[PDB]
């Protein structure tokens, strides 16, 4: 049978980071796959 329960931190799912560029051009995040 099962043992003791496990204490846990609640996870924070962090967003994908995108660098904030300066000048006349910029990084653009775009998906390469998808699902319904």
């Amino acid at each position: 049978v099962p043992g003791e329960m496990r204490l846990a931190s609640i996870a924070f799912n962090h967003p994908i980071q995108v660098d904030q560029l300066n000048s006349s051009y910029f990084k653009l995040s775009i998906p390469t796959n998808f699902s319904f």
Partner: peptide, 4 residues
């Protein structure tokens, strides 16, 4: 605890 983990599933049966």
């Amino acid at each position: 605890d983990t599933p049966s």
